[PDB]
Homo-oligomer: A and B are copies of this chain.
């Protein structure tokens, strides 16, 4: 793995020194980036994805040990999922709130967000950020003349950028493998889609001809955006995943556990040990479990000179044993270090008094908050480009006036943390807030039908007049 994860070329960003038109002239440059992506970058992402699915090295690597009366206690610990689900849930569990002064913009924003289910989309991006360190989204003008937003798989998408300090994006490449469910042959074909500021060009390729990009039938297709539609989100400046740096420690925990399972499985827990020149009937030994007295009578050797002397006989139980103190201290240290470096709370030392369940978590997760605030900034940087695409195509359909600028939108992030509805109600009402009766009742589940309760109260308030 490490030869993939920490290779230098596995995480390079692709620049190109020409314009987009200089890249679509002589498209043979794009093939080189695809080759580099397949050769250096996809292997890293694959290693990361395997660990999220729990297909850690300790399953797929062969033991030199392999025979009958031995066992492969291969075990894989699923730390990577546990980490990424926790960190993404903390960040994007509660949706982003969109705020704007101009309701003509905000209605279009929220109608797009509604149509595209942007809560679920945002969480599905944020998990890619946690697994791979980067994620891509594609926006298209669909048939039925409608604007759609989809996540693009990081294993098959990359972007080429300007060589300038401004680092604009020149072009975006998606490439997919056309595998049957039946068979695979001496060639296998990758469809390539090359997105640009004005359209997408579609190509067919295979690795065996050197990824030659020859146009697929109906190759070019225009789009109404005025910039390249694929947007790239980063987990951090370095585009590194959240568990990528503890994968070594995860392997060590896999090994330190599977080797104890081997010790448990190979050796015998206890045995009766009998020693001495004795006749043991191989059938009487089976009565060993119903025995109460073990009698060992020694052999009496008789010397040629007539002297008689007794052989040694011995009996006792011997039992399998290992260094529990040092292996537990070692596996405790590995587990603790995994949680420390990922800033996840360590469930073996984490014990709660039952006191202030919100403030307590804000205490525990202080370090994860420090990383998330950077992630939050880099996420907003992507959301602003999504918004700029949206306004560009709404104007290019006269769905909104050209005068609108969507950069007035603000994106408000609430961390997923436990809330006490009762203590919040106390705070709100002590602050002089008001609530309607229907809204108040809706907060409490002991009303079966808040709709009917109002009428029943009207009866009580009526017939007390009499």
Contacts and interface: CB of A to CB of B under 8 A. Distances in A.
Nearest to A238: B53
A431 B431 contact: no
B78 A359 contact: no
Contacts of A371: 85, 89
Contacts of A182: 32
B424 A433 contact: no
Interface in A142-190: 142, 148, 150, 152, 165-166, 178, 181-182
Interface stretch (A201-209, A216-224, A270-278, A389-397): A270-278
Contact of A360 (B6, B33, B357): B357
Nearest to A300: B277
A441 B445 contact: no
A273 B366 CA distance: 50
Given A292-B272, A414-B445, A363 B367 contact: no
Contacts of A373: 89, 93, 123, 416
A54 interface: yes
Interface string A273-316: 11111101000011011111111111011011111111111111
Contact of A310 (B32, B312, B446): B312
How many identical subunits does the complex contain?
A: 4
Interface residues of A, number: 199
Contacts of A245: 54, 76, 78, 81
Interface in A305-341: 305-331, 333, 336-337, 340-341
A19 to B, nearest CB: 14
A267 B248 contact: no
A60 to B, nearest CB: 9
Given A53-B240, A429-B430, 13 more contacts: A81-B245, A86-B370, A89-B369, A259-B264, A260-B330, A263-B270, A264-B330, A267-B317, A269-B322, A320-B322, A328-B333, A354-B360, A422-B427
